[PDB]
Amino acid sequence: EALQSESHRLENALSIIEEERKQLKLKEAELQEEYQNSLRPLQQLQYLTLSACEEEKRQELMYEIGQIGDLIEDWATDKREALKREEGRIEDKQNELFYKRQKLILEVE
Amino acid sequence: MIEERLEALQSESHRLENALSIIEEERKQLKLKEAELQEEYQNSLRPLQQLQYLTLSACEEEKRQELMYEIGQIGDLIEDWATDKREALKREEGRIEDKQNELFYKRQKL
């Protein structure tokens, strides 16, 4: 009486994987929106500096702005990498369970 | 039964002495990341402060308030990034203190 558990347990751990996959695709969108929002005041400062500030001093300003660009760039890519790690862990768990199902068929034999 | 008596005393020495070396090096780890944070926090604000200074001299008075607002919006972001990092380090500190207390109150033989 293996399929009773193994087939029913596997169909549920599988669907659990498919929900975490969706949940991850959503955290991807959230990072991008967060990445956008985090850059809005920086971009604001780019535009506003054009109108208000000495042109011969504005390049020193843009350099600072770029410096802040990098910090944000490092923060978002770091996050992006975390979510890529998660994307592997889920995929790993999926294949595992795939390989569990193919051998369970053999057990039901 | 003094041979099992001796064997237990040795694994307890090994156990105690090992957990104590772990914690000492984690504490040293934690303190390093702590100063790493207070360094990262200041370096993350250096360009922000640079702009504050530079905008005073180079930008029209009537518009610099708008700039300073945007600067503040960015400071808030760094603020959240650091404090959250700060709270991660505070979590590690309790973890170690936990492991320490687990080792002290089972003994308590002074």
Author numbering:
A (entry chain B): 7 to 115
B (entry chain A): 1 to 110
Source paper text:
Despite this discouraging trend, LapD2 was the sole exception and after systematic optimization of its crystallization conditions it formed crystals that diffracted to 2.2 Å. The crystallographic phase problem was overcome using selenomethionine-incorporated protein and the single wavelength anomalous dispersion (SAD) technique. The overall structure of LapD2 shows that it adopts a helix-turn-helix fold that is reminiscent of the WXG100 family of small secreted T7SS effectors. However, in contrast to characterized WXG100 proteins, which typically form head-to-toe homodimers mediated by hydrophobic interactions, the turn region of LapD2 contains an intermolecular disulfide bond formed by cysteine 59 that facilitates head-to-head dimerization. The head region of LapD2 also possesses a hydrophobic patch that may contribute to dimerization. Not surprisingly, the energy of head-to-head dimer formation as predicted by the PDBePISA webtool is highly favorable (ΔiG = −21.0) due to the combined effects of burying a hydrophobic patch from the aqueous milieu and possessing a disulfide linkage. PDBePISA also revealed a toe-to-toe homodimer interface, and this interaction was also suggested to be favorable, although with a lower energy of formation (ΔiG = −11.6). Notably, conservation is very low within the interhelical turn region, which contrasts with the highly conserved WXG motif found within structurally similar WXG100 proteins. One of the more striking features of LapD2 is the disulfide bond formed by Cys59 that contributes to dimerization. This residue is not conserved among Lap2 proteins indicating that an intermolecular disulfide bond is likely not a universal property of this protein family. Consistent with not playing an important role in LapD2 function, we found that an S. intermedius GC1825 ΔlapD2 strain expressing plasmid-borne LapD2C59S secretes wild-type levels of TelD.
